[PDB]
From a paper:
The shuttling of insoluble retinoids across the IPM involves the retinol-binding protein 3 ([name]), which is a large approximately 140 kDa glycoprotein, present in almost all vertebrates. [name] resides mainly in the IPM, and it transports retinoids, fatty acids such as docosahexaenoic acid (DHA), and other hydrophobic molecules like retinoic acid, cholesterol and alpha-tocopherol, between the RPE and the photoreceptors, playing an important role in the visual cycle. Based on molecular characteristics, [name] consists of four tandem homologous modules of approximately 300 amino acids each, but elucidation of the three-dimensional structure of the intact multi-modular [name] has been largely evasive. The binding of retinoids to [name] protects the photoreceptors by preventing photodegradation of the retinoids, and it regulates their transport across the IPM.
In the current work, we have determined the structure of the [name] protein from the porcine (Sus scofa; pRBP3) retina at a higher resolution, using [name]. To obtain an intact [name] structure, we used pRBP3 in the presence of CHAPSO, without antibodies or fab fragments (when tested they were detrimental to obtaining good-quality particles). The map sharpened with one b factor (−179.4 Å2) was resolved at 3.67 Å resolution (according to the Fourier Shell Correlation (FSC) = 0.143 criterion), with both flexible arms of the structure being smeared. The local resolution map analysis revealed that the stretch from domain B of Module 2 to domain A of Module 4, inclusive, displays good parameters and could be refined de novo (accordingly, this region was used for the description of the structure analysis); the maps for the remaining portions of [name], at both termini, allowed only rigid body fit. The map displays the four pRBP3 modules, which adopt a ‘pi’ shape fold, similar to the bovine variant, and have good density for the connected alpha helices that bridge the individual modules. The long module-connecting alpha-helices are bent after turn three, with an angle of approximately 39° and overlap with a root mean square deviation (rmsd) of 0.38−1.12 Å. Each module consists of two domains that are bridged by a disordered linker, not visible on our density maps. Domain A is formed by a three-helix bundle followed by a small β strand (using the first 80 residues of the primary sequence) that forms a three-strand anti-parallel β-sheet by the contribution of a two-strand insertion from 20 residues in the middle of domain B. This domain is responsible for binding fatty acids; but on our maps (due to the resolution and/or the ligands being washed out during purification), no density is visible at the binding sites. The pRBP3 primary sequence also harbours seven cysteine residues, five of which could be modelled and do not engage in disulfide bonds.
Numbering used by the authors: 32 to 91, 110 to 284, 309 to 393, 417 to 702, 721 to 1001, 1031 to 1124, 1135 to 1233
Amino acid sequence: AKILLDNYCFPENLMGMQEAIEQATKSPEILAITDPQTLAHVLTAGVQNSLNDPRLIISYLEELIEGLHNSLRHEVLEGNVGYLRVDDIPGQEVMNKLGSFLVVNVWEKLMGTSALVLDLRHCTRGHVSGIPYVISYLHPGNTVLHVDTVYDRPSNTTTEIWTLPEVLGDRYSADKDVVVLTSSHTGGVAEDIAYILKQMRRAIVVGERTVGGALDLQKLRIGQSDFFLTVPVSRAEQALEKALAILKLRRALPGVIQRLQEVLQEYYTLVDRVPALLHHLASMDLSSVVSEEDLVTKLNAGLQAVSEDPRLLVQVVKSKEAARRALVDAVFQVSVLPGNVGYLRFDSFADASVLGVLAPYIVHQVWEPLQDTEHLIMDLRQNPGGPSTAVPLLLSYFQGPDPGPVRLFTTYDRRTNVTQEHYSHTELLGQRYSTQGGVYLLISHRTATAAEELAFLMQSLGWATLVGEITAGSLLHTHTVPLLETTEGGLSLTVPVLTFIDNHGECWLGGGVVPDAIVLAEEALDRAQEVLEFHRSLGELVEGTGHLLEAHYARPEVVGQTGALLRAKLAQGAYRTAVDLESLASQLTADLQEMSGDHRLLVFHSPEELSYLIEALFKTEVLPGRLGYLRFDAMAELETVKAIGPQLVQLVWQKLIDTAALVVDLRYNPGSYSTAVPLLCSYFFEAEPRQHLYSVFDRATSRVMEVWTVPQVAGQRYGPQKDLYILVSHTSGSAAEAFAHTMQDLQRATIIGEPTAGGALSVGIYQVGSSPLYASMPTQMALSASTGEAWDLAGVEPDITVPMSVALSTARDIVALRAKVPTVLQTAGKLVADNYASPEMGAKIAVKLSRLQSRYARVTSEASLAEMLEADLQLLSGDPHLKTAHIFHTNVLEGNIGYLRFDMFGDRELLTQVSELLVEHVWKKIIHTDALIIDMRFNIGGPTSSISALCSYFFDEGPPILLDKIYNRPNDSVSELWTHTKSIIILTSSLTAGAAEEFTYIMKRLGRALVIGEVTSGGSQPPQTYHVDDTNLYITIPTARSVGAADGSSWEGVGVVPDVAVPAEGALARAQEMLQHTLL
């Protein structure tokens, strides 16, 4: 084992472990370890087991054409398929003498085949330089890509596959497919050939998984004989035609969907969603499918997903006069079950024609004894049925509630494209058995098709209810279409043909009907008898419920229609689907809640210790900022509240007497006893007057009661002016609801939290005449003090809607903002007095703004104070510019007339750099024109410093004539406007900004130009935003009022009105009309 020490030195499995094995070195007489023949087989189960290596074996010019030619055989097989074989892997030096022959002759015949297969079973050994070329021949592309992890120890360089462009002629087409073949005899060199292809996904692998070992194994021969080394230094027989079968199927996979698209959209039955269907039919990938079994699985999943109807029929796995009336009475058996109940059993539906021609015997035998039955039961458990042609005839006998003809079911056939309405046959020769009293169908899991249709039709129309197990769901309205059968394939597809839209207009996909009583098939008869026994008293329960609801309900206006609706439902028999008491109770609850609009109505079937208790119940603390946090965990007493008196008032109430702000924690209060609530409310209001809190209306007393505050309960009253806050959550009880309503109606608190559902002021459970059923209904109602309307019936609507966990922080923010309100008003008034267009008007605003303290003391929250302050400022000052918030073209017209238009403003410094540009841009085209037209109807706005530039550019050089005096309050002075040392008419509109019209204004004072258009927007100077100490207020203050005008009546607010009013779109057309005439 001296060779092994140097050749194989990979640390991934050695780390020098063989150095200990190297210590054996010669070891020529170590047979004592094991006898000669093995001890290599022992090492096969020894070191090789510890190595965990891919196998280890130790034992005890025409000339090149001739050798290679025997290694391959290429021919065109059926289906236009090429076969390739190889036993010696080529090398770089080989193609220097053999590559031309491979491409001239062998490769030419390969490209003429639609599919190619390569064989690697007989590959044993070869060089490494041959693999980059075989992939290059196979790879359609020309870009070099390297994806490989293999390294050779003597080369000391990692090897990655390279697709060289050295190939001669056209490469393999990307459209055609190839498959690799391998076996146990496949060599390592051929193993990585398939390994790269599988990762490339270009080809597919067939047959048994190969060894997957090292690509090459180093060989060495020393000693006398009997052993040559094969150390790895470099790190199912039927599959020949199996791929051909795959290729043949793959040859038809381009055509596997053409027929499927043809048969699917034949008619409207299955293509109700055809825009999605046809789109997805071409979306299936032919590379993913690799086998016939896999083809079935992928097509089935895709077909169900696109149609969104998985339960419907889908793709299926491929395939490899005496005797006459004697019979009439024999097929149909009728018995008088005790209790005057008719029993009917069916075995087969026969045919509609047979029943039509044998009707008189059939009716004379079955309906003559069945006419006297109070209730009828049908036992079709043992009835496959078969044809469904006679279904409408049987349904005609059961006329239903309405004797008039009515459609039962609508059927549409794909083959005929005919929609037929099945009206109730009213010419039957029978006694017309009525559905009154109920008919019950006993259905097993063997109803098959016709009986199952009859049962489903009975259930849908409501004329019957089903007792028994679920149905099989098998249906005969389905045709299996052939689809691509060849040799052993035999694929098959089944497609539904009938739609069978019911009376409700909902298509019945089929597959099984759920009965109203899931009971074992054997136990169906006793269950049906029990349902008979229960259904005899259905009317009594409904009548009792109606009478009770009339007797003890707070709102009679609801009862006036509730009684009628319940009676109408009972008369028709819509409750026949109830099988047990609980189901009937649930249905009654659903009906009452859905039509009465009330969700509270419900029906269902069957010393030191005092101090410790009160301290455990309450959580009293004074939060920072002088505000209380009294919490009512559970307080729903009647007289013990006034019984305890001082022992609790001194301990709890006397501590929070001087809080100056009180917060009630009603989030956790399941108390639902609105009995002594007004006593608690009387503390907050004024003692001397009798304040009407709310009025309660009692049905039993049948008149409206009034609730008044207690004149005197204790000497510690909270106080009227001091604020209050109430916190309500979704789990709040009934008492807290009443407290919140009575504080919100009188406008005493500010409810913060989330809406709470369920008032239930006072509920009392009453029992109907029958024991098992109890009714829970609100026997009380409260009317508001302000108006006679009842309460919201759904709970309070908090002014601030926040989750119950964050409610306390919101209350803290609210009280902080309320405390901050007066300072905000004071500083806003001071700022307005300081800066404004009119100093006297600003002083008046500041004086008057201080008188709105009372109105601002009840602000709901932030961002409403801002809007209400804006409204107050805008009503105080006629300027609508007081807002508050919270966090170049040139043309020449006809007749020698110039044109100008611009709507954006920039700073004088900004225009200084571009001042030179505009001289040769806007003035070059207008220097020669007789007249000018200027438009600013779409002006956006900007600073007023650019005014002087506009006047200076327009005016000719000379002594300054411009005169404008403007009071600048931030400057605390007045500034005069001076200019920098034909005809023109202004085009204005309402969209002109507040920075535009002053240009128009100064034009009309000097008389140089006239103005055409309509009224301006009444803007102002660009307001200077201001920041208040509160972060939520940005006050905008107009200033720099134009006062230098002799008249003293500013354009502000009112705007500028031109001489003649014209529309903005017509103003431009009207702009040049008079210019032409005045030059005409």
